């Protein structure tokens, strides 16, 4: 019968059990929840604060990373990303009336505009990252957006405060003077301090006829006011680890209101806070809020008792689908293991090749930002390919240089993009080629399928071409790929801004 | 009986005499072109090359500070301001053949025209200009690349020929991004003029009509510093169908070229190049040249710009002053380095030129107090040394003119130290000097955004087509009184004003924003 190396180990109570010929398998809880997302609205967002006292109360507030808010819910979002507690989120939470709030220019600017801005941002040679950079630069920075903007300063100092490196002491100047917090500052602050969160807000309008999603976050919206962000995030609905691995998983809670693993991962990782039991006074907000946090942390209870297996090959391959904190969690046990150890060894002589070469890296760098193969480089890419036992190492090391905010990995694949041989870089070039298509099908989905799909009175066959068209872009690893899809909008979409875009997405080749 | 103190000295010929009264005159002649400004055409571009001979062949090109190009013009704008000589650049005018190149940026520029009117003029918060919007709407084409080609190769030259020695880490970066394959923004080439002489700021210009009114496209470095200036370039050519501001001396020098109180300043600082002579008429330039006729008209060029550059020489201008001392406090530095030993053999002269020793030390020890705080902090406060400066510089003044004209020294316009000085002093606990440079920076600021909000706002009214005369005269007079605003309340009164007389007609088939003139007016008061 199988044998137990390890059993419930940390917070995702980790097991493995071995079996005769070798397999083995895994067996683990959901993470606790990295990402909050909040699908708000002005009147029921009063009971939010319950469910924020629900995540502190179980110190599970900590470990959120990431808060997103979608539409109304962007205020909230942001409030919670600065770093705001339960008892200061209740208080002010209840002192708000936003609904009365939320009625000024920059609102009333976005109805006239929408059909103007449609028109345009659909019309381009070339696409744009998301309508959000238009309104970015159309609306540069009342009493909405000071409020967010000055509680989020006063969590952020105070945070600040009770910790520097130059970067977070530069934010923390620019926003004494008065300067308010923008999502780039999140990002690098949350990198030091835990309270405060990336941030995204979200939301979806109508412009021309055709529905268009607005994100704003660090990545498209860097340098902006996240008040700002937050407000133009409400006026939009009035206008109607390792990614190979299984045991590398996120989990979410996301807030509601009373392949496709992923959806339904998505409707277990939801929980729909209550509004009818057995305009509003403290008593009923504190029974809103206490209905919501109990109904969330019955939600955290009951995803703590979920259990999940994952069988591999061997206790090798097992060990390389573990992250390195995973891997941390249950090495004394496997070290107890010959097999365990000689897994744990393998990793071990892995991260000093990899460090090895990042090391290279930095050197080359203090002598030219332009990278090329100095002899110590060469070095540390033969020595990464002698560390192979097998192709699958090679394949494996080739998404470790991948790893998303390794600069210096970024480097090298680039210098990688143009050749003549290290293994392992070859990997690693095909492995980013392969993320890159991924990260623009996923754009063209958003951006250009979406709207025409969702289109009001769009005919079937469109629908089903769209449809069809969401799928291979699903399947896509190369431009030629890409390409092949977008040929067959330009060629069957029966109309011609839908035609445009496809034409002006292809990938030049 | 007026006596000579100085006698055509240096290159601005400068000269002064004392009366019997004491009454002082200074005469002198223009300085060399700083600023070049290409009013530009394609096929009459072709003559731009006679006029880059004349300025080389001069000595003058190397002064030239900053390259303006309007409309087709840009290309060749950004050319020059790469740092290409006379003989490349003809070259490469020759071999052109621009009918052909001067593609779908262009034509998203006439289909989205009238949009982008719309949205610019009625913002709620007004931006920059519509460079802003182009900019974030179409970043990165013959035109385009030949140009970004030739601009990189001529930059990266021209940074070779540096000294091995130092070189900034901020140029060897550019280097390194143009190496690759980057093209040269605005903001490289300001960042690159300061060590290069041969390199120059650029700003490209253009005029463009958008939903009925013409807009003034504007890029350069403070409005579209990461833009590339080849697309800059591009977007241009296709629209839609160190001295003393104060002082009469401190005068800058333009060469603005042509085809055949400022205002008159502007028409001296004109050359015509012609376009029609016994080798023939190319008026129409405005068919196949022979490269025979395009030597011709490129030589006609070179001679009308020598001549022109020569007459400049020529010209004198006199400006009185109650006093030497006064006249000295109208030089700046470099002109009075030119004749201090000549004054210094003068009693009055020499109390004048002792006070500017004097300033010039107390104004440097107020940079190094400032320099000493931000080693310790980058916000700044008022640390002893600091205070001690400023109580110094206070004590320098002889009358009240030297603390306004101190004043105005510290808002010197690339002085970092000071400006973060003028911020803190913004908040307020007296120093006189700092006090009125800081009534003179808020002075400065009003100035800037009266020319802003003309550009932006009233040009495009008043130059609409069909705009009835009253409201033409009514803008007209907001120009003026703008020009002559010193405060926030100055520059609301004139806004005022428009929103109470401004008349739009009523057309409700123009979609949203018709009238954005009175709205415009509105969102652009200062809060006080």
């Known amino acids: 019968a199988k044998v137990p190396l390890v059993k419930g180990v940390g917070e995702r109570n980790l097991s493995i059990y071995r079996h005769s010929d070798g397999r083995v398998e895994v067996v683990v809880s959901p993470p606790p929840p990295a990402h909050l997302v909040l699908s708000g609205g002005g009147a029921k967002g009063i009971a939010f604060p319950g469910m924020v006292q629900a995540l502190e109360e179980a ?29 200061a989120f209740t208080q002010l939470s209840n002192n708000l009336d936003l609904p009365r709030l939320l009625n ?53 100092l105070a945070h600040i405060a009770g910790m520097r490196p130059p970067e977070v002491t530069a934010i923390a100047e620019r926003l004494s003077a008065g300067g308010g917090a923008t999502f780039r500052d999140l990002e690098v602050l949350s990198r030091h301090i835990p309270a405060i969160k990336q941030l995204n807000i979200t939301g979806t309008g109508m412009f021309d006829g055709r529905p268009q999603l607005v994100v704003f976050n660090a990545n498209l919206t860097p340098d902006m006011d996240i008040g700002r962000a937050a407000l133009i995030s409400g006026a939009l609905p009035g206008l109607f680890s390792f990614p190979e691995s299984p045991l590398g998983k996120d989990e979410a809670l996301i807030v509601k209101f009373e392949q496709n693993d992923r959806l339904q991962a998505f409707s277990e990782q939801t929980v729909t806070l209550p509004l009818n039991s057995d305009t509003m006074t403290p008593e009923q907000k504190q029974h809103l809020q206490a209905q919501a946090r109990q109904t969330v942390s019955g939600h955290l209870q009951q995803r703590e008792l979920e259990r999940e297996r994952h069988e591999f090959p061997s206790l090798n391959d097992a060990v390389m689908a573990m992250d390195d904190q995973m891997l941390a969690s249950v090495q004394v046990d496997l070290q107890n293991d010959a097999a365990g150890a000689e897994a744990l060894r393998f990793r071990k002589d892995a991260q000093q090749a990899l460090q090895a070469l990042d090391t290279a890296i930095a050197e080359a760098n203090q002598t030219s930002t332009s990278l090329v193969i100095t002899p110590k480089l060469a070095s540390a890419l033969r020595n990464l390919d002698a560390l192979a036992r097998r192709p699958e190492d090679i394949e494996w090391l080739g998404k470790r240089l991948n790893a998303p905010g390794q600069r210096n990995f970024q480097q090298l694949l680039q210098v990688g993009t ?52 969401v799928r291979d872009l699903g399947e896509a690893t190369t431009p030629a790929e890409f390409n092949r899809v977008l040929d067959g909008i330009v060629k069957h979409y029966r109309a011609s801004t839908t035609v445009e875009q496809a034409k002006a997405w292809r990938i030049p080749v």
Do not use: H
């Not at 507030?61 to 990303?81: E, N, P, R």
């Not at 920075?141 to 000071?146: G, H, I, T, V, Y």
């Not at 903007?149 to 952020?156: D, L, P, T």
């Open 418 to 469: 143009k050749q003549g041989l290290s293994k392992v870089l070859t990997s690693a070039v095909a492995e980013m080629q392969k993320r890159d298509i991924g990260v623009k099908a996923e754009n063209f989905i958003r951006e250009v399928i979406y709207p025409s799909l969702y289109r009001p009175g769009q005919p079937a066959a469109n629908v089903e071409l769209l449809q069809r068209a």
């Open 104 to 156: 000024d220019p920059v609102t009333a600017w976005l109805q006239e505009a929408s059909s103007e801005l449609g028109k345009l941002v659909r019309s381009l040679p070339g696409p744009v990252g998301n309508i959000s950079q238009l309104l970015l630069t159309l609306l540069p920075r009342q009493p909405l957006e000071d409020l967010i903007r000055n509680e989020s300063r006063q969590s952020i």
């Open 59 to 87: 110190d599970k507030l900590k470990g959120v990373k990431v808060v997103s808010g979608s539409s109304a819910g962007a205020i909230c979002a942001a409030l919670l990303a600065s770093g705001m507690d339960a008892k």
